[PDB]
Structures are given as structure tokens and as C-alpha cells.
RNA sequence: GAAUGUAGUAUGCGGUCCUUGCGGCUGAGA
């Protein structure tokens, strides 16, 4: 029964809610589902369209309705501090003012651990790799796709060796191919499933995954959304990114940002499609940079398709630097 | 070829022992 301890720390406010919408707290079930999704996406490149094999290996690692999960995840210590922070891309409907909407959320920092345990070393390594990929390449909680809930590891104590912590942009980009190679080798050794079937992933996976970098900051206080006015001169990194997103000049589209090149709830069609771009914030050597993770897939959603070049032309317009690939 | 009575199927005996209502699921999408 090997163990692995992860001491997380949120650099941006986390919006993770239980049954009570107003009260926000760290949830083991939500993060476990997120790790399941991240393992499916990260190992999707090794599987491609092999849905059945991916489902089999997922039911092996994380359990199913016929076998208990061999990975047990529990949050032990939570030094949280409930506070109020505004939504990234949601503004109130106030007459004239129309300021942001600030719900309760976990304050930045709030170092809380997260304990991993498993009876098999390989499954523990797989879970740790999926969780570290989730922590690095995205956030957890509400509005995670628009720069919220991202965390970084403050301490590590595990038995099974894992990938080293990146120190700059180049190491972070190389970590993608690293983790992909390690999970591919581990899966081929243990499960011995299909060896990288040649097909674009029908879902969000690492088969077509690109990492982008945009902007840099040195003070965390000037990172998240602070100014409630566009004309304000105290726009932070998140605020400046939102202002650039609002400018229709950068992205070339008929409807601009209001088209279906992003999350489904925009316009007449409600649907449930999320934004392929996963906006996040990463700190590299005490320097904070906006992480723009984009997942390209063969089909956007059953029923319609969209042009992916709008995202890439938008990234090139505001000078987003592609670190991977 | 004639010439019943008296009597409790009763005495003693634990439907008990061993069994996690468990397994799997992002309060999230813009």
C-alpha cells in the first residue's frame, strides 16, 4: 500500500461548491472526477479512437460499478479562508454600473494537502501523473476554463518516482511530451493495450494538444481580476487578458467572441459544450504567466462543427507564445 | 348341556453461528 502526499496551494481563487451553492469548500469527489477526466485526456493520445480500451483501463484504475477503485484520494488538512472574488467573464446586469459578480470562493494561497494511496506502484504513478498534469495544465472548480482554480505544488513526498518540477517555460513544455512518454511506457508495460492507434481523438485529449503563454507578472496581487472598469489603468493580467478577449479585432470571426468557437452557452444554442481553450495561470520561478491550454478534437459536438483557426489566429493576434509543441 | 379395574408421551433442549448496503459518478457549462 504505497502512499503519495501532494501539498497543493491555489495561486488563484478556487470556486468549488458542495450541495450548498453559497458555501464553497474543497471536495474530494470533484477533484477525483477531474483527475478521471485529465487521465482520459492525457492518455487519449496513446489511445486515440480506442474508446473500449480506454474505458477498460479507466475502470481498472479508478474503479467501476463492478470493482472498487484501487486508488483512494482524501484531503487531510485544509488551511482555507473563505472570501469573495469575482467571476472571470460574468458581469452583473446593474443599470449603468454593470460591475462584476463576486461569489464566495477559497482565497489565493490556502495550502491544503491531498493524499494518494494505492496497492500497486504502477497505478499510483499513473494517478500521480494524471493529478500533476491536471494541476499544471488547468484548474479545479467553477469557471476553471477562464482562469480560476489553478494551483501549484508547494511540497511533494511520494515513494514512486515522478517527473521533475519544471523551472521555466521550456521545462514546462517538455513536461508534456515527458508525461505522455512515461504514461505510454507504463501502460504498454502493464496493460499492454493498443500501441497508439492512428486516429484523431473524438474527444478532448493530448492527440492534438497545444500549450500557449501570454504575458508575465511579478506580483500576485496584480494578477487576478481587480479593476471593475475597462477604462481603469490598474488592469491586472487576468483583467488585461479579458480586455483583449473582448476586443473583436484580435480574433477573426463573423460573430467574434460571441460565435460558437467557445463554450456552448453563447447565443440561441444553449447546449453543454465547454470552451476548448482552458485559460489558466502558472507561476514559473516566482514569475506568473497566463496559461492558454487548447484541446483540438476531430468533432466539436455531435450535430455541428466549428473552425479551429479562430483560436489560433486569436493567440497569434495578441502575441500568445506557443511553448508546446 | 347349562353356568375388568387403576394409568398425563412425558422429563431435560436458546433457530443459533459466520456476512461493512457496499461499488462507480466534477455543482459544473458560457
From TrEMBL:
The chain positions of domain Cmr1 C-terminal read 206-325
Q: Which UniProt keywords apply?
A: Antiviral defense
Superkingdom of the organism of origin: Archaea
CRISPR type III-associated protein domain span: 7-152
Q: Which Pfam families match?
A: Cmr1_C, RAMPs
Query: GO terms for biological process?
Result: defense response to virus
Its recorded name reads: Type III-B CRISPR module RAMP protein Cmr1
The scientific name of the source species is Archaeoglobus fulgidus (strain ATCC 49558 / DSM 4304 / JCM 9628 / NBRC 100126 / VC-16)
Amino acid at each position: 500500500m504505497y502512499s503519495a502526499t501532494f501539498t497543493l496551494e491555489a495561486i488563484t481563487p478556487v470556486f468549488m461548491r458542495g450541495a450548498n451553492q453559497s458555501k464553497a469548500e474543497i471536495r474530494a469527489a470533484s477533484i477525483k472526477g477531474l483527475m478521471r477526466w485529465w487521465f482520459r485526456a492525457l492518455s487519449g493520445s496513446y489511445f486515440g479512437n480506442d474508446v473500449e480500451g480506454l474505458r477498460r483501463v479507466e475502470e481498472y484504475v479508478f474503479g467501476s460499478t463492478k470493482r472498487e477503485s484501487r486508488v483512494v484520494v482524501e484531503v487531510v488538512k485544509e488551511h482555507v479562508e473563505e472570501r469573495f472574488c469575482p467571476l472571470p467573464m460574468v458581469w452583473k446586469k446593474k443599470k449603468g454600473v454593470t460591475t462584476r459578480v463576486s461569489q464566495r470562493a477559497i482565497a489565493p494561497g490556502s495550502k491544503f494537502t491531498l493524499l494518494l494511496t494505492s496497492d500497486d506502484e504502477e497505478v499510483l504513478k499513473l494517478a500521480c501523473y494524471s493529478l500533476i498534469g491536471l494541476v499544471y495544465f488547468g484548474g479545479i472548480g467553477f469557471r476553471c476554463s477562464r482562469g480560476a482554480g489553478s494551483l501549484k505544488i508547494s511540497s511533494l513526498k511520494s515513494d514512486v518516482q515522478l517527473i521533475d518540477l519544471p523551472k521555466n517555460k521550456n521545462q514546462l513544455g517538455q513536461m508534456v511530451n515527458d508525461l505522455t512518454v512515461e504514461i505510454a511506457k507504463i501502460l504498454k508495460k502493464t496493460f499492454l493495450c493498443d500501441h497508439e492507434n492512428k486516429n484523431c481523438t473524438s474527444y478532448s485529449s493530448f492527440w492534438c494538444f497545444y500549450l500557449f503563454l501570454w504575458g508575465e507578472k511579478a506580483e500576485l496581487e496584480e494578477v487576478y481580476y481587480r479593476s471593475n472598469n475597462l477604462e481603469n489603468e490598474r488592469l491586472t493580467l487576468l483583467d488585461l487578458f479579458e480586455k483583449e478577449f473582448k476586443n473583436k479585432n484580435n480574433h477573426l470571426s463573423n460573430y467574434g467572441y460571441r460565435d460558437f468557437v467557445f463554450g456552448l452557452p453563447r447565443g440561441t444554442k444553449k447546449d453543454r459544450r465547454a470552451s476548448p481553450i482552458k485559460v489558466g495561470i502558472t507561476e514559473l520561478s516566482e514569475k506568473y504567466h497566463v496559461r492558454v491550454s487548447v484541446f483540438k478534437t476531430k468533432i466539436f459536438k455531435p450535430g455541428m462543427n466549428v473552425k479551429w483557426d479562430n483560436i489560433f489566429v486569436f493567440l497569434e493576434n495578441i502575441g500568445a507564445e506557443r511553448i508546446y509543441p
